[PDB]
């Protein structure tokens, strides 16, 4: 982004996407996790219920990402997880999820001009939780619709500067 503005219409995208996120999905939060250069993640972005914490403007480093998974989630890799307590989770992962309160978790890229801006995560915190296809699909593309706006408002905001430069 540019700014000027930019970054103004792309953080009423993002509180959409937790919003229509944590109604779709009847959950306990919904986060919008934005990665840098190196790939550390930052909430930018979170709809959770009454009596969870906060985990708004909170920055987390998981190095698995850069590591794994940054070509994975670009390709579109989704990852439900009905229990975090099951699947094999190391303490270090745990421990980034504990205060939280996580109990399961949905996670859905945000693929914006073939990079992986960052990723669309949902928390179930009260008990486990099977996530249905229909639900994974709904969020997908919730998802990855967001992304493709700001991918295309983004083209615009540069055809605009461009054809007002270039005007006789
Ligand atoms: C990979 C990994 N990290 C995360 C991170 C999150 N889950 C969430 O709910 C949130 C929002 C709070 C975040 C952020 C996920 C979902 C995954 C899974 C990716 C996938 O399988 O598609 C991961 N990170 C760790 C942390 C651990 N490993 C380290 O080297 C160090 C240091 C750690 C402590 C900080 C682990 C164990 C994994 C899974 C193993 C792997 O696939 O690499």
Same mark, same amino acid.
């Given at each position: 982004?540019?700014?000027?503005?930019?970054?103004?219409?792309?953080?009423?995208?993002?509180?959409?996407?937790?919003?229509?996120?944590?109604?779709?999905?009847? @959950?306990?939060?919904?986060?919008?996790?934005?990665?840098?250069?190196?790939?550390?993640?930052?909430?930018?972005?979170?709809?959770?219920?009454?009596?969870?914490?906060?985990?708004?403007?909170?920055?987390?480093?998981?190095? @698995?990402?850069?590591?794994?998974?940054?070509?994975?989630?670009?390709?579109?890799?989704?990852?439900?997880?009905?229990?975090?307590?099951?699947?094999?989770?190391?303490? @270090?992962?745990?421990?980034?999820?504990?205060?939280?309160?996580?109990?399961?978790?949905?996670?859905?890229?945000?693929?914006?001009?073939?990079?992986?801006?960052?990723?669309?995560?949902?928390?179930?915190?009260?008990?486990?939780?099977?996530?249905?296809?229909?639900?994974?699909?709904?969020?997908?593309?919730?998802?990855?619709?967001?992304?493709?706006?700001?991918?295309?408002?983004?083209?615009?905001?540069?055809?605009?500067?461009?054809?007002?430069?270039?005007?006789?």
């Amino acid at each position: 982004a540019v700014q000027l503005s930019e970054l103004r219409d792309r953080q009423a995208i993002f509180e959409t996407l937790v919003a229509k996120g944590r109604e779709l999905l009847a @959950c306990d939060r919904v986060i919008v996790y934005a990665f840098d250069d190196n790939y550390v993640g930052t909430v930018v972005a979170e709809s959770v219920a009454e009596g969870w914490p906060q985990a708004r403007d909170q920055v987390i480093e998981d190095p @698995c990402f850069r590591e794994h998974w940054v070509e994975a989630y670009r390709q579109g890799r989704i990852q439900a997880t009905t229990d975090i307590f099951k699947a094999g989770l190391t303490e @270090c992962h745990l421990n980034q999820l504990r205060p939280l309160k996580v109990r399961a978790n949905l996670v859905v890229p945000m693929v914006i001009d073939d990079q992986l801006f960052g990723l669309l995560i949902a928390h179930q915190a009260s008990e486990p939780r099977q996530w249905q296809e229909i639900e994974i699909d709904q969020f997908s593309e919730l998802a990855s619709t967001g992304s493709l706006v700001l991918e295309r408002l983004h083209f615009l905001e540069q055809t605009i500067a461009s054809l007002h430069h270039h005007h006789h």
